[PDB]
């Protein structure tokens, strides 16, 4: 079944750091970064070759207008929220995450959520056409937004506009989004303090989902096995590592198995001398 996702996130910060923009705003198709806006540049730029190639100047100017609009409102929001929480100065952030998921071309999810200082604040419940207040300070936002009848317009964006654009983007980037890149895998070992730690590292795979397991006696061994999760490379590919602790002299009893969409059968790898 063909699943696709469009997600926009944005952050407004009181303390981004020296030289850095206080407002950053990015979009993702199927988890791949494709657009970026910030408060210094004051425009959206492409982050994939397919959007650069297929979008025209009207698209960029139109998105830039939205970015500038959102920058302005989130600047206001930071001030509003600091006052609501009775806070002056210090480090504070407003974050938003929203978008849509489609399955065989049809919408299966639409969401619109905010966090303040890293904790859930409000979310749209599209099913009841209300806004949730995760914390007491969000009750005035719920009230304001429900009284203003914004739910209709937000539902239309999430079920129509978002979906239409996601369908277009998936067409623009079909070959790139559907590609497979095989991991290059290395097993490495280090002994210390009477423990042989074996590492299985998979470099450069796409898409992101992978399973990397340590086997002993034919069986997956999660005991003393630790995964670093899936982390990004610079280039649209991913990395993962998994370790297991073994007894010195037991190295040849272990085998790493890698399951990934690029590999018709799982890869199997052992520790070389």
């Amino acid at each position: 079944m063909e699943l696709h996702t469009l997600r926009y996130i944005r952050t407004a910060m009181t303390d981004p750091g020296p030289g850095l923009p206080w407002y950053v705003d990015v979009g993702y198709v199927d988890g791949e970064l494709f657009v970026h806006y910030n408060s210094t540049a004051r425009r959206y730029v492409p982050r994939t070759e397919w959007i650069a190639a297929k979008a025209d100047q009207q698209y960029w100017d139109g998105q830039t207008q939205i970015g500038q609009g959102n920058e302005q409102i989130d600047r206001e929001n930071l001030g509003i929220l600091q006052r609501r929480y009775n806070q002056t100065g210090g480090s504070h952030t407003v974050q938003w995450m929203y978008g849509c998921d489609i399955l065989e071309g049809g919408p299966i999810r639409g969401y619109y959520q905010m966090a303040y200082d890293g904790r859930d604040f409000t979310a749209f419940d599209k099913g009841t056409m209300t806004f949730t207040a995760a914390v007491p300070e969000a009750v005035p936002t719920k009230r304001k937004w429900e009284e203003g009848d914004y739910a209709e317009g937000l539902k239309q964006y999430l079920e129509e506009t978002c979906v239409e654009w996601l369908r277009r983007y998936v067409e623009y980037g079909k070959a790139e989004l559907g590609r497979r890149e095989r991991p290059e895998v290395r097993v490495w070992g280090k002994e210390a303090d009477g423990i042989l730690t074996l590492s299985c590292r998979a470099h450069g795979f796409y898409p992101r989902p992978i399973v990397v397991s340590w086997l002993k006696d034919g069986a997956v061994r999660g005991q003393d096995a630790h995964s670093g999760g899936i982390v990004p490379n610079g280039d649209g590919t991913y990395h993962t590592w998994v370790t297991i602790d073994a007894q010195p002299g037991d190295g040849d009893k272990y085998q790493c198995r890698v399951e990934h969409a690029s590999l018709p059968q799982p890869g199997l790898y052992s520790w070389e001398p």
């Binding site: 705003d25 998105q63 959102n70 989130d74 929001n77 409000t122 317009g153 506009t161």
Partner: peptide, 9 residues
């Protein structure tokens, strides 16, 4: 496309 926020909090 992104969405322009409809109202401040």
């Amino acid at each position: 496309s992104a969405l322009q926020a409809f109202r401040e909090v």
